[PDB]
Design an enzyme around this catalytic site. Structure first.
Site, PDB file in Angstrom:
ATOM      1  N   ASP B 359     -51.015  69.197  58.204  1.00 15.58           N
ATOM      2  CA  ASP B 359     -49.718  68.866  58.781  1.00 15.58           C
ATOM      3  C   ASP B 359     -49.294  69.903  59.816  1.00 15.58           C
ATOM      4  O   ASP B 359     -49.209  71.094  59.516  1.00 15.58           O
ATOM      5  CB  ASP B 359     -48.657  68.754  57.684  1.00 15.58           C
ATOM      6  CG  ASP B 359     -47.245  68.851  58.227  1.00 15.58           C
ATOM      7  OD1 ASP B 359     -46.669  69.959  58.196  1.00 15.58           O
ATOM      8  OD2 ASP B 359     -46.712  67.818  58.686  1.00 15.58           O
ATOM      9  N   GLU B 395     -52.709  66.645  62.108  1.00 16.16           N
ATOM     10  CA  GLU B 395     -51.591  66.489  63.031  1.00 16.16           C
ATOM     11  C   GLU B 395     -51.756  67.386  64.254  1.00 16.16           C
ATOM     12  O   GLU B 395     -51.472  68.582  64.202  1.00 16.16           O
ATOM     13  CB  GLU B 395     -50.267  66.799  62.328  1.00 16.16           C
ATOM     14  CG  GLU B 395     -49.154  65.812  62.639  1.00 16.16           C
ATOM     15  CD  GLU B 395     -47.960  65.974  61.718  1.00 16.16           C
ATOM     16  OE1 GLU B 395     -47.095  65.072  61.700  1.00 16.16           O
ATOM     17  OE2 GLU B 395     -47.886  67.001  61.012  1.00 16.16           O
TER      18      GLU B 395
END
Ligand SMILES: *[C@@H]1O[C@H](CO)[C@@H](O[C@H]2O[C@H](C)[C@@H](N[C@H]3CC(CO)[C@@H](O)[C@H](O)[C@H]3O)[C@H](O)[C@H]2O)[C@H](O)[C@H]1O
Ligand SMILES: *[C@@H]1O[C@H](CO)[C@@H](O[C@H]2O[C@H](C)[C@@H](N[C@H]3CC(CO)[C@@H](O)[C@H](O)[C@H]3O)[C@H](O)[C@H]2O)[C@H](O)[C@H]1O
Ligand SMILES: OC[C@H]1O[C@H](O)[C@H](O)[C@@H](O)[C@@H]1O
Ligand SMILES: OC[C@H]1O[C@H](O)[C@H](O)[C@@H](O)[C@@H]1O
Ligand SMILES: OC[C@H]1O[C@H](O)[C@H](O)[C@@H](O)[C@@H]1O
Ligand SMILES: OC[C@H]1O[C@H](O)[C@H](O)[C@@H](O)[C@@H]1O
Lengths: 715, 714
Positions: B359, B395
């Site tokens: 992330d 990400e």
């Protein structure tokens, strides 16, 4: 008249790098890194014919910057090599020459060595635009072939030594040349003389077990090449500090040779050693290659992908940044090179069962572009690694480039070669008078050097001699270096050898001389084996090995460097001395310490864990401590030590009194309180019956150049 | 009695954390601290965790690592640490031994923060804020670390190791352990919304039915509820805010958490693996739940503040924030980098995870001020023997300056394709993009990942994720309704590229119902018909709705609960998604390892890939640039450059995709052959004269309609 696709094949795998016998799919998997190559060709050879490819497969698959193929039917033993195509532009660093047959940098075995010949250079030799030119002679027939191998080896008795082995703190290192070890050992049948197998034989194993050393540090055993300029002089690379591949053990040490048997021959040797409770540390060259600069040959890395692998002049990219002093320096900043080096390390650990590495020219590994950085990528990756975090790491704390003196600067887990220790200690006995500090510190594991970085006396690898420089014999047998047999008009080798002849040069008959040498030899030996830190013995100095004042015998593959096992009275009677000294060091914790001595009373005792006296009878003061001297004298309080074992017990020894006298003349020292039996000395003469004890703060005369250790048996 | 009048051993530096050492009957405690002057090991009892049962000073040290070995201790033991050091906040030194700290190598944490001013190291009230030194003992408010027994028999388990689901054929199912099986009155609760529940036979079966290959869990790294949530009756639902990288979230554990959460997690993974399902964990390495300054002092701030956190280089009393969560882990430090890498290796070899989706992966490349994709962390990670074999999804950006790093990621790395997400959303929403735009999204977006040498399956295609709307809400709201978060609706992205179909929210107008179900299937087909790796957002097949909340990060309730009660509209879509996933995985032409080239191949007439216009004439030039609401292309299954691991070229069927995003009807001219209708987004019964088109014939295509076709003859 067929195609590259009328031959049964598979796409293969990017990993691992190199060639892998995949038993299950009955074939081999060929992985090769190159982010600049435009095309790659697998070259398969056969036993008999090695001038031409048996077959040419084109590696057509490429995951990222890794070409991979899988050829069915290939098993272990299969010879192969690499062609790499790509842009040739020596101005820009691009040096692709697909005529030049290359070695798989991930080979675990390499067949022969190089048959020197202009055609291995990928520029025109005699041409005026050297190394700017593009030579297109095929070189297959001269370059050794890579061998696919079967990695299966049964480490019988292996696994158990794995396990509370030799801690750095009780270790005693023995630097040996695989060949030189045992070439002149008719005790073994020839043909294992000067090989691995020879090294790990009963005869030898028993020797080492006797001698009392715990770990052996082998000189470079990465497959290496003989520099041409050494060949063109009827000479050889004897030391081996010119690696061409990082995964394959040198073929010229294998008894079985040469085809797969070098790695098989190696593993047995380590197996054999471990069975005997002996660690193995290999000298490791990672800082430079044998491809040298430009003008040098094109064998392996230069061909595959020159931009990586090699540090280039950022403004030119035609020439090579050289902090190693050998023509090129490995680009330890490129991810693939960092991986290769690390793989190599893990490979040699888990596969070959090495126990540690002595890195040559360490600092060269912490180079970015022009600057040193003990916090570069490579070192941090090495530090976090689960496998490597467990092995012994030792360093030559310097390279030759500017600002490459890195003593004391290596991350924890590193022991570094103490060159302060060697130089000082050598100049102390020589006769020089250094400040009481500069020697007491040395004697105590160089706290000044290493305590500023949270390291312990472990990290200090103490040594008087080494493959670099004189031997212990020639350290007391010479003032200047006699390296005329190297064929460099005696223009190589350290000039300052901080040595002394004992009043001559070379061999002698003058008994007064020999006696001096034999004394000093024992002064050195008493020192090293009584100083805090980790002591290293140079392989042979227990034989009084001589290189005839050659202090740089790197190319001397002969009797100059051969171990001589023929021992007369003198030579052997010393062997006995090194044995007993070593045993002394080992039997006494007050010298194998994990913590430094502070200068105070501990645990509420009335004594200091240590104490430095003067020549009569007197604790050192701020001024005498800074002022020079040739007479050091100090007491270690076995009982008032802050040494705890792994079970949380503190660790008494006995109380000693070391008296070191480098003064050329005699002196009279006043013994501190209590009563002081004699144990060890430099005296080659019958120990006077009035020297074997000292009582009541009284005093005794001591011939110059003499070391004495005493044990307090009553206070 | 001094710290030396109880039995101890000096212990060992490696490895980090607490480690049960059977043979020596006791535990080994190790803890990295560069700057600490003193370290104290606290032993609590199960009953009493207000004060310490015993205090032990970690005297022994080895470089920058404190350690001791305490005889007698067994697994199950509660412990924390007190790190003594200098307090010079404007310098970055924020040591406060009044604050009891969590061991950052804790493999198990027992409970969470009891929010309270005492846990902040500075005086909450005082007017000079973080420069002040609060001397309240925070012990009774801080969760204790636990010594875990690591042992665990992975039945069979070791044979998927082995080959597993190759990225080529993968289908990703993003799930939230809690919501997944919370509202699951199949099972017993005390097992709803828990690791064990997720792995129950009922859910495994479901997951096999649906036909997904790998599950991707929301963060399971032990995390805390931000206090600005606690003081709203709220909690951290997604859990993107951890304080420990080794121990799994307690609040997901059926068997409590004195080691329960570890045990319970493995057996979930073990079970998944016995049903041939891969486990990928969303992981947060880029930031901590300790926020900026003014944040609490729980773990890192307290153990070493100059080590763990990127500090403003001019101040070092303020935290560089590239994540948006107060602080940023600096993966430039040798020990920080080691911890992240240790953690990764731990979840692999120890928890048998199959890969991670990072992330805000970009913030991991920040080293100094900028994104160097050549950093020490990534490099070590690349060369690692273990992590070398696992999946690494990203990400590919952060909230930072110049953080947008789409496509720049190292190899083996895959990327969440944000451009796909958007492009496809806008296509079916109405907007008309360049025929090139949508075309690229469909061929796995070569115009992005091809430049870096990457493959089509390194592109992770998705129309929906946990950020923003769900699929049901994607065709059901134009604006966001985050009111429920209590932030005056200032949170959550504003541009959602969504289209309510004609209401805002739930309706009755069937015209609007039906528009919805048309769109849901339009998005569904496109996804499972594009080159690359498709990711389904859990609950989307269930037609899940967050009530138009596009940021339910803190909504731990019915809004995010998987609603398992399905009517007909539901079951029909569920069925449809199934049939469509089954199609994707049947046909190698979509699970490609390489890119379609615009040309013929293998000396065949037909070219592997072709795009057409309304009429037969192939997509010429200016037509490739000019916008379009209609896409049509023909994959030639029998002329692909696709080779399995055995050196066999693959082939498939030849398919003809029709993507009319235009709102009005359109006539299209099929290319030469004789074609059969395989699937469409039509909810009405398909007219019999659409089931087989022939001979350059023409067909009426309703607006917002996607069709796949197979050429039975030519
Ligand atoms: C550490 O690493 C050093 C460099 O690899 C080792 O160097 C020793 O062996 C080298 C081959 C030798 N090279 C130079 C020799 C001479 C003249 O003497 C030149 O003609 C060459 O071009 C140079 O490359 C070094 O001088 C020698 O010390 C060292 O032993 C290792 O411990
Ligand atoms: C990727 O990583 C993101 C950050 O770790 C995740 O963020 C989501 O959860 C966060 C806790 C939330 N934090 C902010 C909320 C608000 C107002 O809405 C502020 O008051 C806080 O101080 C902020 O920290 C994010 O807004 C939310 O998107 C994301 O889900 C992961 O995929
Ligand atoms: O530059 C090379 C030199 O570096 C350092 O001075 C070393 O102490 C010395 O032994 C070595 O020869
Ligand atoms: O540059 C090399 C020199 O560096 C430092 O001055 C060392 O103290 C010295 O021993 C060494 O020779
Ligand atoms: O900075 C974070 C943001 O970067 C980009 O705008 C992405 O498209 C968006 O989804 C993400 O939240
Ligand atoms: O706000 C979202 C946008 O942020 C930046 O401009 C990115 O370069 C762009 O690709 C992205 O869509």
């Amino acid at each position: 008249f067929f195609r590259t696709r009328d031959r049964p094949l598979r796409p293969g795998d990017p990993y691992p790098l190199g060639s892998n016998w995949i038993e299950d799919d009955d074939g081999v998997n060929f992985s090769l890194f190159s982010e600049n190559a435009e095309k790659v060709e697998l070259l398969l050879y056969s036993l008999t014919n090695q001038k031409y490819p048996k077959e040419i497969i084109e590696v057509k698959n490429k995951t990222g910057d890794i070409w991979h193929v899988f050829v069915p039917g290939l098993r272990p033993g299969q010879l192969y090599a690499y062609r790499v195509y790509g842009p040739y532009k020596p101005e820009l660093g691009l040096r692709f020459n697909p005529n030049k047959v290359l070695i798989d940098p991930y080979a675990k075995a390499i067949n022969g060595s190089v048959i020197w010949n202009d055609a291995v250079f990928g520029y025109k030799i005699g041409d005026q635009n050297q190394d700017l030119t593009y030579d297109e002679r095929d070189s297959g027939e001269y370059v050794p072939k890579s061998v696919v191998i079967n990695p299966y080896f049964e480490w019988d008795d292996e696994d158990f030594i794995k396990g509370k082995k030799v801690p750095l703190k009780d270790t005693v290192i023995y630097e040996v040349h695989v060949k030189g070890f045992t070439k002149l050992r008719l005790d073994l049948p020839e043909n294992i003389r000067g090989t691995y197998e020879g090294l790990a034989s009963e005869q030898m194993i028993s020797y080492l077990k006797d001698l009392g050393i715990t770990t052996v540090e082998l000189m470079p055993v990465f497959h290496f090449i003989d520099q041409r300029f050494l060949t063109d002089k009827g000479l050889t690379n004897y030391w081996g500090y010119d690696p061409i591949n990082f995964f394959s053990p040198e073929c010229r040490y294998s008894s079985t040779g040469c085809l797969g048997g070098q790695v098989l021959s190696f593993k047995k040797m380590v197996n054999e050693l471990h069975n005997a409770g002996i660690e193995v540390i290999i000298d490791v060259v990672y800082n430079h290659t044998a491809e040298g600069n430009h003008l040098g040959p094109t064998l392996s890395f230069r061909g595959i992908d020159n931009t990586a692998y090699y540090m280039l002049q950022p403004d030119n990219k035609r020439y090579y940044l050289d902090f190693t002093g050998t023509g090129n320096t490995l680009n330890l900043s490129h991810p693939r090179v960092i991986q290769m080096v690390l793989d190599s390390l893990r490979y040699w650990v888990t596969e070959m069962h090495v126990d540690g590495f002595r890195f040559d020219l360490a600092a060269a590994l912490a180079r970015e572009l022009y600057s040193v950085n003990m916090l570069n990528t490579f070192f941090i990756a090495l530090q976090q690694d689960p496998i490597l975090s467990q092995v012994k790491l030792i360093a030559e704390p310097w390279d030759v480039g500017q600002g490459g003196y890195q003593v004391g600067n290596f991350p924890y887990q590193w022991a570094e070669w103490n060159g302060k220790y060697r130089d000082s200690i050598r100049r102390f006995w020589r006769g020089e008078a250094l400040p009481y500090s500069e020697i007491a510190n040395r004697l105590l594991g160089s706290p000044d050097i290493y305590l500023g970085n949270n390291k312990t006396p472990f990290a200090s690898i103490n040594y008087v001699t080494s493959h670099d420089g004189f031997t212990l014999e020639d350290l007391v047998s010479y003032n200047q270096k006699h390296n005329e047999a190297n064929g460099f008009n005696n223009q190589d080798g350290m000039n300052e050898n901080y040595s002394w002849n004992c009043g001559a040069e070379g061999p002698t008959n003058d008994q007064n001389v020999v006696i001096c040498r034999e004394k000093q030899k024992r002064n050195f030996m008493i020192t090293l084996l009584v100083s805090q830190g980790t002591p290293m013995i140079l392989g042979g100095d227990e034989l009084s090995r001589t290189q005839r004042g050659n202090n740089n015998a790197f190319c001397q593959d002969n009797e100059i460097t051969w171990f001589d096992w023929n021992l007369d009275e003198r030579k052997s009677k010393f062997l006995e001395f090194v044995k007993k000294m070593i045993q002394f060091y080992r039997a006494h914790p007050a010298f194998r310490r994990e913590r430094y001595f502070q200068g105070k009373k501990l645990f509420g005792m009335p004594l200091k864990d240590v104490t430095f006296y003067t020549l009569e009878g007197r604790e050192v003061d701020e001024k005498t401590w800074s002022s020079p001297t040739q007479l050091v004298i100090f007491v270690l309080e076995g009982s008032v030590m802050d040494e705890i074992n792994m079970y949380g017990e503190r660790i008494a020894d006995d109380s000693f009194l070391i008296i070191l006298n480098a003064n050329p003349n005699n002196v009279k020292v006043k013994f501190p309180k209590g009563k002081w039996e004699l144990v060890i000395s430099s005296y080659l003469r019958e120990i006077k019956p009035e020297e074997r004890i000292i009582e009541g703060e009284k005093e005794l005369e001591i011939e110059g150049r003499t070391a004495l250790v005493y044990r307090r048996i009553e206070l």
